[PDB]
Design a protein around this ligand. Structure first.
Ligand SMILES: N[C@@H](Cc1cc(F)c(O)c(F)c1)C(=O)O
Ligand SMILES: N[C@@H](Cc1cc(F)c(O)c(F)c1)C(=O)O
Lengths: 306, 306
């Protein structure tokens, strides 16, 4: 493989690839991702963390930003409560096997120079640019608040003050990151990960919704959720089960089936699993049973360490 | 004339009158007005300052806030440049015969608690409410910035941290002040002054529209500006000359005219001057000559002290 290829693996985009290669030449390099503290930690978080681990193995210093102020501005609750949730998320990230630097937003000093730079960034960012960047991030509100447009300019300001070389996040974070690449003196290389489809096949997998597989879910809960999940035969696009098998399952994979239904099946890659599912040679239920058991094995050490 | 009446004199509105009377009972009371630093100090500023003087005589502790940060957010230029202009405005305010405490926006540090309260104010203020409050204040821009909606919540936060009892400003500040009266624990009494019409009879009198009469303008410049000013016969509304005579001129007033045009005329109140002008008994030219010479007398000590 390669350090570049390992990092690029299972990503939606890299901004840009040539900039990434120029960063890999450095001996000291840092990558930073920020999370709004979530009550439950699902696969959507795990995918990001796994990518941060890939960067860690490449020689990057990993920084995990617990955006408690961001969640506060995004109408998620009270500061100290979000702080508590952030602490729980840190322990979960540790249980995933990621040893990194965990920084809260509660500190942040918020000195004169920080707020001054916020004003300077707010002076160069239009309201329409700021709102568009918050479309996939801002909590649904009939009446958008002023805090909604303070959110993205702070995330840009945080990228600047961290001085990191690489910024990581979901595809929902791209518009903010591109805005950060335009205003800031030092252009950060953005690595955006795919957005996981919810179990019901409607909308993204979020903690605020009821379509997630938490990393600490019981094996019975995992089996039930996967079983009830949206998974039409032949359709790969928008299929969460196919997504989980693509981003989490380890290959070569053996699918257990009764002899009456074709017997056990062994695939060597996701592409083979994808082809077998496209031509409907594999039934969704057998796919679900395979993915469920493998997901249980994978999430088990994390479940045990909590 | 009561202290209440003396304060209410030549105001547009007071929010509210009963709240004002409850403040007048206190031995220690404060009134605060904020100005975006302007290159030239015009009659609009003088009207505000005169009202601050009325409050000073009423027993109020006067605070002038030089909003250099506000102007910075409103796209007026660079901080240090705005600060310089702010200093010049302080000297002009002193020359007006107003001794008070002058506070800059850049000196008042942006500690964690300040920015934190800004976040909470932004969390309770909609984008639509914030923009509507900036309609008569914000610099004209085809592409409104995020800084535009940080402006009004800061002005609200400033009223809170100052702890003043009475807030003073033009009618353009009312939507911000009423927003401040809604969100803040302590409800401040708002005294709003009328908006002076420009010399061309179009739009408000501003330093950026060139329809103003600076307090340090030369007598020849004042005579010229008054002479070319919009002043149709019979029309009192939207007439800058009538406005100047109403808010600045001292009565009883004697209007000097040649015997061929009716000879010298002596009015005792603005109401009589208004009635004489409505019935076209007084020609606009004679009004202009009267207003000009009196304004020159009034502004003379100010110009000399500069
Ligand atoms: N926008 C991120 C949270 C976040 C991450 C950051 F790196 C960040 O700097 C920030 F202010 C907020 C999210 O959607 O969770
Ligand atoms: N709104 C004022 C400037 C100003 C006054 C204040 F009192 C104030 O607190 C502020 F932040 C800005 C103006 O338009 O001049």
């Amino acid at each position: 493989m390669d350090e570049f290829e390992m990092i690029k693996r299972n990503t939606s985009e890299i901004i840009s690839e040539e900039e990434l290669r120029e960063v890999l030449k450095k001996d000291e390099k840092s990558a930073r991702i920020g999370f709004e503290p979530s009550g439950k930690i699902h696969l959507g978080h795990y995918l990001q963390i796994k990518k941060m681990i890939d960067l860690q193995n490449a020689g990057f210093d990993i920084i995990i930003y617990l955006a408690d102020l961001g969640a506060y501005l995004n109408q998620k609750g009270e500061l100290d409560e979000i702080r508590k949730i952030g602490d729980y998320n840190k322990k979960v990230f540790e249980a995933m096997g990621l040893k990194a630097k965990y920084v809260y937003g509660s500190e942040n000093c918020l000195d004169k120079d920080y707020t001054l730079n916020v004003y300077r960034l707010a002076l160069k960012t239009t309201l329409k640019r700021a709102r568009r960047s918050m479309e996939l991030i801002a909590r649904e509100d009939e009446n958008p608040k002023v805090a909604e447009v303070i959110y993205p300019i702070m995330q840009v300001n945080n990228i600047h003050y961290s001085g990191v070389d690489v910024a990581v996040g979901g595809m929902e974070q791209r518009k903010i990151h591109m805005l950060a690449r335009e205003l800031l003196p030092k252009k950060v290389v953005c690595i955006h990960n795919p957005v996981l489809t919810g179990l019901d096949g409607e909308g993204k997998m979020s903690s605020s919704k009821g379509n997630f597989i938490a990393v600490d879910d019981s094996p019975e809960e995992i089996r039930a959720k996967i079983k009830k999940a949206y998974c039409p035969a032949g359709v790969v696009e928008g299929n969460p089960i196919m997504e989980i098998a693509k981003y989490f399952l380890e290959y070569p994979l053996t699918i257990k089936r009764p002899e009456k239904f074709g017997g056990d099946l062994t695939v060597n890659s996701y592409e083979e699993l994808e082809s077998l599912f496209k031509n409907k040679e594999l039934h969704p239920m057998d796919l679900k049973n395979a993915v469920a058991e493998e997901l249980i094995k994978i999430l088990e050490p994390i479940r045990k360490r909590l």
